[PDB]
């Protein structure tokens, strides 16, 4: 079966720049290669067919080239919406085959996170639960830590985090820290804080709230 | 409208139907066979025309048994139709040469 | 219009079997092949097999352990993939695409998330998330809603039934003791709230339960 090698697996480029993805076939396949785009949680989308033929509805930014065993999918002037995973697929010999994929990544200017803390809702409390949510949004680079301090004393139990892949609206990242305590455990404590240490500020960005 | 010109005609149309059903049946028969290349209609059709005229470039060919059967039928329809035309041309030339002789 | 329609999700216990569907609409031909691609979380795409509706023949990717079985239904314009005797390995998003005999997939279905566990279905719980009094706001205000205690994935979270897109962030779920949990975030101008409504729509296909939840200021 034909094998399409897509390397590098990840590509890091600065805005407006030109970028090129490679696809290599085990053997000559003519121009029977096709490119697909797949953003976070989306389905694949045809970008280029037969290596160079353009598809309608696709920005004139995308263009492909190659023939034989080496194919390239270029983007003239990268941009946030272009952040995703790209795959190549061949129609030369049965069965059709897919590439391992390549993730595009943009490198923008540093951005400090926008912290936000939220007190558990009454609908949840009414059910023996209390989740204090904290959002660290639109930052860059993606490296960042979140410290939870209850009544001045740091906390580590019940804290579940979640990070988002680079956003396709502005090329940044976002995280979500959630501390899940019971109504009780929640009842016997006053202030909950959420500290965020990020490359843009030596001093940790904090946000708190008192149960009263 | 003489027979020989009707058969030729009837043979050209029939050839076109075989070419088409050929491209179709070819893909249907070839998909599923690893390494097979006769697997998309557009080229399967070019494959047909090349086989019917018997030019056979070899850039495309069936590798499965059914594909090959479809191949044999396409070849034959092609040879028979093209031979039916040259036959119509000989009936024309022969009958007209009679005229130029009086008979 | 959406040419291929697939069921948001399906739950299955080990050893069991499910039958997925893909109803097509638009310009149908006889040359049309419907394909099935499998995508495990984080990994890439993987061709499973193909079927030609008009003739009814199907081919499968022989490189992998054969679990699928394809069939079609002319009249209704629906293709079916019968996956049987599954394991944890068989759970992922399964797409179907339409190929017009020319090699490339011009259109894809939204895909169907398939989970293989014993844990039973559990509709989600949407809890509001409005700031706290001391929270001094500025030009922009951030609101959000917590969806937890659900199973299995996925869940689709919208803001104002789609009219609100710019500013949304929906964090990936976290699995803790057979129950996923996630939070979505919206950011509109401070002024616009709460003068204007801001509701979080939360659809959860595995339990057929789409629910709304307005986000208003606290007591
Ligand atoms: C019109 C003739 C079409 C011939 C198609 C041959 C396909 C071979 C194949 O790819 O066949 C594929 C298939 C194996 O997958 O072969 C098989 O078993 C099927 C058997 C097929 C044909 C007969 C066998 C040979 C007869 C000649 C021996 C004469 C001795 C005297
Ligand atoms: C004349 C040859 C029969 C038509 C091709 C049938 C292919 C069936 C698939 O295996
Ligand atoms: K010849
Ligand atoms: K020849
Ligand atoms: K030849
Ligand atoms: K030759
Ligand atoms: K040759
Ligand atoms: K050769
Ligand atoms: K001859």
PDB file of N, CA, C and O in Angstrom, chain B residues 2-34:
ATOM      1  N   UNK B   2     -28.317   2.084 -46.826  1.00  0.00           N
ATOM      2  CA  UNK B   2     -27.898   0.693 -46.964  1.00  0.00           C
ATOM      3  C   UNK B   2     -27.494   0.016 -45.663  1.00  0.00           C
ATOM      4  O   UNK B   2     -27.021   0.658 -44.729  1.00  0.00           O
ATOM      5  N   UNK B   3     -27.670  -1.298 -45.617  1.00  0.00           N
ATOM      6  CA  UNK B   3     -27.315  -2.069 -44.433  1.00  0.00           C
ATOM      7  C   UNK B   3     -25.933  -1.700 -43.904  1.00  0.00           C
ATOM      8  O   UNK B   3     -25.796  -1.195 -42.792  1.00  0.00           O
ATOM      9  N   UNK B   4     -24.912  -1.945 -44.719  1.00  0.00           N
ATOM     10  CA  UNK B   4     -23.534  -1.680 -44.329  1.00  0.00           C
ATOM     11  C   UNK B   4     -23.267  -0.330 -43.677  1.00  0.00           C
ATOM     12  O   UNK B   4     -22.298  -0.195 -42.933  1.00  0.00           O
ATOM     13  N   UNK B   5     -24.106   0.666 -43.941  1.00  0.00           N
ATOM     14  CA  UNK B   5     -23.906   1.968 -43.312  1.00  0.00           C
ATOM     15  C   UNK B   5     -24.682   2.027 -41.994  1.00  0.00           C
ATOM     16  O   UNK B   5     -24.416   2.872 -41.130  1.00  0.00           O
ATOM     17  N   UNK B   6     -25.648   1.125 -41.851  1.00  0.00           N
ATOM     18  CA  UNK B   6     -26.455   1.058 -40.642  1.00  0.00           C
ATOM     19  C   UNK B   6     -25.687   0.299 -39.585  1.00  0.00           C
ATOM     20  O   UNK B   6     -25.657   0.697 -38.426  1.00  0.00           O
ATOM     21  N   UNK B   7     -25.066  -0.800 -39.994  1.00  0.00           N
ATOM     22  CA  UNK B   7     -24.288  -1.608 -39.071  1.00  0.00           C
ATOM     23  C   UNK B   7     -23.116  -0.773 -38.550  1.00  0.00           C
ATOM     24  O   UNK B   7     -22.822  -0.791 -37.352  1.00  0.00           O
ATOM     25  N   UNK B   8     -22.456  -0.037 -39.440  1.00  0.00           N
ATOM     26  CA  UNK B   8     -21.338   0.794 -39.026  1.00  0.00           C
ATOM     27  C   UNK B   8     -21.838   1.741 -37.944  1.00  0.00           C
ATOM     28  O   UNK B   8     -21.277   1.802 -36.842  1.00  0.00           O
ATOM     29  N   UNK B   9     -22.904   2.471 -38.265  1.00  0.00           N
ATOM     30  CA  UNK B   9     -23.484   3.403 -37.314  1.00  0.00           C
ATOM     31  C   UNK B   9     -23.815   2.691 -36.023  1.00  0.00           C
ATOM     32  O   UNK B   9     -23.298   3.048 -34.969  1.00  0.00           O
ATOM     33  N   UNK B  10     -24.663   1.669 -36.113  1.00  0.00           N
ATOM     34  CA  UNK B  10     -25.069   0.889 -34.951  1.00  0.00           C
ATOM     35  C   UNK B  10     -23.863   0.392 -34.165  1.00  0.00           C
ATOM     36  O   UNK B  10     -23.950   0.141 -32.958  1.00  0.00           O
ATOM     37  N   UNK B  11     -22.735   0.243 -34.848  1.00  0.00           N
ATOM     38  CA  UNK B  11     -21.531  -0.240 -34.197  1.00  0.00           C
ATOM     39  C   UNK B  11     -20.792   0.883 -33.472  1.00  0.00           C
ATOM     40  O   UNK B  11     -20.146   0.646 -32.454  1.00  0.00           O
ATOM     41  N   UNK B  12     -20.882   2.104 -33.978  1.00  0.00           N
ATOM     42  CA  UNK B  12     -20.200   3.212 -33.318  1.00  0.00           C
ATOM     43  C   UNK B  12     -20.883   3.555 -31.999  1.00  0.00           C
ATOM     44  O   UNK B  12     -20.239   3.824 -30.986  1.00  0.00           O
ATOM     45  N   UNK B  13     -22.202   3.547 -32.025  1.00  0.00           N
ATOM     46  CA  UNK B  13     -22.978   3.859 -30.849  1.00  0.00           C
ATOM     47  C   UNK B  13     -22.773   2.751 -29.834  1.00  0.00           C
ATOM     48  O   UNK B  13     -22.503   3.011 -28.660  1.00  0.00           O
ATOM     49  N   UNK B  14     -22.886   1.511 -30.290  1.00  0.00           N
ATOM     50  CA  UNK B  14     -22.707   0.381 -29.397  1.00  0.00           C
ATOM     51  C   UNK B  14     -21.292   0.410 -28.801  1.00  0.00           C
ATOM     52  O   UNK B  14     -21.087   0.073 -27.638  1.00  0.00           O
ATOM     53  N   UNK B  15     -20.314   0.824 -29.593  1.00  0.00           N
ATOM     54  CA  UNK B  15     -18.955   0.895 -29.090  1.00  0.00           C
ATOM     55  C   UNK B  15     -18.898   1.886 -27.924  1.00  0.00           C
ATOM     56  O   UNK B  15     -18.315   1.587 -26.874  1.00  0.00           O
ATOM     57  N   UNK B  16     -19.494   3.063 -28.118  1.00  0.00           N
ATOM     58  CA  UNK B  16     -19.535   4.100 -27.086  1.00  0.00           C
ATOM     59  C   UNK B  16     -20.223   3.613 -25.805  1.00  0.00           C
ATOM     60  O   UNK B  16     -19.845   4.005 -24.705  1.00  0.00           O
ATOM     61  N   UNK B  17     -21.238   2.768 -25.938  1.00  0.00           N
ATOM     62  CA  UNK B  17     -21.914   2.267 -24.748  1.00  0.00           C
ATOM     63  C   UNK B  17     -21.006   1.285 -24.031  1.00  0.00           C
ATOM     64  O   UNK B  17     -20.947   1.268 -22.810  1.00  0.00           O
ATOM     65  N   UNK B  18     -20.297   0.462 -24.795  1.00  0.00           N
ATOM     66  CA  UNK B  18     -19.376  -0.496 -24.202  1.00  0.00           C
ATOM     67  C   UNK B  18     -18.225   0.266 -23.556  1.00  0.00           C
ATOM     68  O   UNK B  18     -17.830  -0.070 -22.448  1.00  0.00           O
ATOM     69  N   UNK B  19     -17.661   1.270 -24.235  1.00  0.00           N
ATOM     70  CA  UNK B  19     -16.584   2.051 -23.625  1.00  0.00           C
ATOM     71  C   UNK B  19     -17.039   2.488 -22.253  1.00  0.00           C
ATOM     72  O   UNK B  19     -16.382   2.177 -21.250  1.00  0.00           O
ATOM     73  N   UNK B  20     -18.176   3.178 -22.192  1.00  0.00           N
ATOM     74  CA  UNK B  20     -18.752   3.674 -20.927  1.00  0.00           C
ATOM     75  C   UNK B  20     -19.039   2.628 -19.865  1.00  0.00           C
ATOM     76  O   UNK B  20     -18.635   2.803 -18.725  1.00  0.00           O
ATOM     77  N   UNK B  21     -19.773   1.574 -20.216  1.00  0.00           N
ATOM     78  CA  UNK B  21     -20.085   0.531 -19.256  1.00  0.00           C
ATOM     79  C   UNK B  21     -18.778  -0.131 -18.852  1.00  0.00           C
ATOM     80  O   UNK B  21     -18.630  -0.683 -17.748  1.00  0.00           O
ATOM     81  N   UNK B  22     -17.819  -0.069 -19.772  1.00  0.00           N
ATOM     82  CA  UNK B  22     -16.501  -0.633 -19.553  1.00  0.00           C
ATOM     83  C   UNK B  22     -15.784   0.161 -18.490  1.00  0.00           C
ATOM     84  O   UNK B  22     -15.309  -0.399 -17.504  1.00  0.00           O
ATOM     85  N   UNK B  23     -15.699   1.468 -18.668  1.00  0.00           N
ATOM     86  CA  UNK B  23     -15.048   2.271 -17.646  1.00  0.00           C
ATOM     87  C   UNK B  23     -15.723   2.006 -16.299  1.00  0.00           C
ATOM     88  O   UNK B  23     -15.055   1.852 -15.273  1.00  0.00           O
ATOM     89  N   UNK B  24     -17.049   1.942 -16.303  1.00  0.00           N
ATOM     90  CA  UNK B  24     -17.777   1.705 -15.066  1.00  0.00           C
ATOM     91  C   UNK B  24     -17.451   0.339 -14.455  1.00  0.00           C
ATOM     92  O   UNK B  24     -16.947   0.255 -13.331  1.00  0.00           O
ATOM     93  N   UNK B  25     -17.729  -0.731 -15.189  1.00  0.00           N
ATOM     94  CA  UNK B  25     -17.462  -2.062 -14.671  1.00  0.00           C
ATOM     95  C   UNK B  25     -15.995  -2.255 -14.294  1.00  0.00           C
ATOM     96  O   UNK B  25     -15.677  -3.002 -13.369  1.00  0.00           O
ATOM     97  N   UNK B  26     -15.100  -1.570 -14.997  1.00  0.00           N
ATOM     98  CA  UNK B  26     -13.680  -1.696 -14.718  1.00  0.00           C
ATOM     99  C   UNK B  26     -13.360  -1.234 -13.299  1.00  0.00           C
ATOM    100  O   UNK B  26     -12.699  -1.948 -12.539  1.00  0.00           O
ATOM    101  N   UNK B  27     -13.827  -0.041 -12.934  1.00  0.00           N
ATOM    102  CA  UNK B  27     -13.572   0.474 -11.596  1.00  0.00           C
ATOM    103  C   UNK B  27     -14.192  -0.434 -10.552  1.00  0.00           C
ATOM    104  O   UNK B  27     -13.573  -0.760  -9.546  1.00  0.00           O
ATOM    105  N   UNK B  28     -15.429  -0.835 -10.794  1.00  0.00           N
ATOM    106  CA  UNK B  28     -16.129  -1.709  -9.864  1.00  0.00           C
ATOM    107  C   UNK B  28     -15.362  -3.000  -9.612  1.00  0.00           C
ATOM    108  O   UNK B  28     -15.303  -3.489  -8.490  1.00  0.00           O
ATOM    109  N   UNK B  29     -14.754  -3.539 -10.661  1.00  0.00           N
ATOM    110  CA  UNK B  29     -13.998  -4.786 -10.562  1.00  0.00           C
ATOM    111  C   UNK B  29     -12.602  -4.637  -9.955  1.00  0.00           C
ATOM    112  O   UNK B  29     -12.123  -5.529  -9.248  1.00  0.00           O
ATOM    113  N   UNK B  30     -11.963  -3.504 -10.230  1.00  0.00           N
ATOM    114  CA  UNK B  30     -10.606  -3.247  -9.767  1.00  0.00           C
ATOM    115  C   UNK B  30     -10.455  -2.720  -8.344  1.00  0.00           C
ATOM    116  O   UNK B  30      -9.454  -3.019  -7.689  1.00  0.00           O
ATOM    117  N   UNK B  31     -11.409  -1.923  -7.863  1.00  0.00           N
ATOM    118  CA  UNK B  31     -11.305  -1.436  -6.496  1.00  0.00           C
ATOM    119  C   UNK B  31     -11.353  -2.688  -5.620  1.00  0.00           C
ATOM    120  O   UNK B  31     -12.039  -3.655  -5.950  1.00  0.00           O
ATOM    121  N   UNK B  32     -10.608  -2.693  -4.523  1.00  0.00           N
ATOM    122  CA  UNK B  32     -10.595  -3.875  -3.695  1.00  0.00           C
ATOM    123  C   UNK B  32      -9.323  -4.677  -3.916  1.00  0.00           C
ATOM    124  O   UNK B  32      -8.887  -5.371  -3.003  1.00  0.00           O
ATOM    125  N   UNK B  33      -8.725  -4.591  -5.110  1.00  0.00           N
ATOM    126  CA  UNK B  33      -7.474  -5.307  -5.418  1.00  0.00           C
ATOM    127  C   UNK B  33      -6.257  -4.416  -5.104  1.00  0.00           C
ATOM    128  O   UNK B  33      -6.018  -3.402  -5.763  1.00  0.00           O
ATOM    129  N   UNK B  34      -5.463  -4.791  -4.097  1.00  0.00           N
ATOM    130  CA  UNK B  34      -4.285  -4.006  -3.709  1.00  0.00           C
ATOM    131  C   UNK B  34      -3.318  -3.709  -4.850  1.00  0.00           C
ATOM    132  O   UNK B  34      -2.966  -4.592  -5.628  1.00  0.00           O
TER     133      UNK B  34
END
